[PDB]
Amino acid sequence: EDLDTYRERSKQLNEKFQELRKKVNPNIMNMIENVEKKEAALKTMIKTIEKDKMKIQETISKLNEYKRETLVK
Amino acid sequence: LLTEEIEPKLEKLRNEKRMFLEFQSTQTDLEKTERIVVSYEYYNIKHKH
Amino acid sequence: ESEIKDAETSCLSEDELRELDVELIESKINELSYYVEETNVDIG
Amino acid sequence: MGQIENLNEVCLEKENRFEIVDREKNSLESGKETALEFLEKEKQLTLLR
């Protein structure tokens, strides 16, 4: 009225391990949303870096040709 | 440098999410096993009674 | 081996094993459980 | 003067950016120290038990 051997011990160990995770994780939804927005920001920053390197190289590599073509004419 | 120094916190959050989901699944399986064991023990106690 | 050394040292032996009250020990255990329920110790 | 002054300004700005708050980590450390003191009290009570 109040309420295979190693299975109960494993269940108790799993329960104790979950209790050792007392850090509140009911906000995992908004945590994953913040993770997603921060990863989107990181992808935009990586795109910024790659386009910046492309600009740095292409600006000079095109200005050399522009000058060499304009000065002669 | 700032991003690679904060990346420890990103990995800590990834752990606190993945291990949290794993612990939730383990707690579900433990509740199922506990219910099965409780049913078996109740049947045995009823037979003994 | 703290749980063994302390047990061997605590077990005169009869006076040190009977003078302690059970109600105080139960209250201390309950307080320890309540503290560990929200402690969340870490090496951070 | 110009070059050394602008280099010193940017290096001071970087050093400040490295130490903007210096309190959030300290706050987390104080919280973890309080948690460790609570855990030590719990361990003493467990040894008594």
Swiss-Prot record, chain B:
Subcellular location: Nucleus; Cytoplasm; Chromosome
Domain of life: Eukaryota
Family, per entry: Belongs to the SMC family. SMC2 subfamily.
Chain's role: Central component of the condensin complex, a complex required for conversion of interphase chromatin into mitotic-like condense chromosomes. The condensin complex probably introduces positive supercoils into relaxed DNA in the presence of type I topoisomerases and converts nicked DNA into positive knotted forms in the presence of type II topoisomerases.
Subunit structure of this chain's protein: Forms a heterodimer with SMC4. Component of the condensin complex, which contains the SMC2 and SMC4 heterodimer, and three non SMC subunits that probably regulate the complex: BRN1, YCS4 and YCG1/YCS5.
Domain-level remarks: The flexible SMC hinge domain, which separates the large intramolecular coiled coil regions, allows the heterodimerization with SMC4, forming a V-shaped heterodimer.
Note: Present with 3290 molecules/cell in log phase SD medium.
The name this protein goes by in its record: Structural maintenance of chromosomes protein 2
Gene designation: SMC2
Full-protein interval shown: 198 to 246 of 1170
From Swiss-Prot, chain C:
Species: Saccharomyces cerevisiae (strain ATCC 204508 / S288c)
Protein's UniProt name: Structural maintenance of chromosomes protein 4
Subcellular location: Nucleus; Cytoplasm; Chromosome
Role noted for this protein: Central component of the condensin complex, a complex required for conversion of interphase chromatin into mitotic-like condense chromosomes. The condensin complex probably introduces positive supercoils into relaxed DNA in the presence of type I topoisomerases and converts nicked DNA into positive knotted forms in the presence of type II topoisomerases.
Complex formation: Forms a heterodimer with SMC2. Component of the condensin complex, which contains the SMC2 and SMC4 heterodimer, and three non SMC subunits that probably regulate the complex: BRN1, YCS4 and YCG1/YCS5.
Span within the parent record: 1159 to 1223 of 1418
Other comments on record: Present with 573 molecules/cell in log phase SD medium.
Domain notes: The flexible SMC hinge domain, which separates the large intramolecular coiled coil regions, allows the heterodimerization with SMC2, forming a V-shaped heterodimer.
Similarity section: Belongs to the SMC family. SMC4 subfamily.
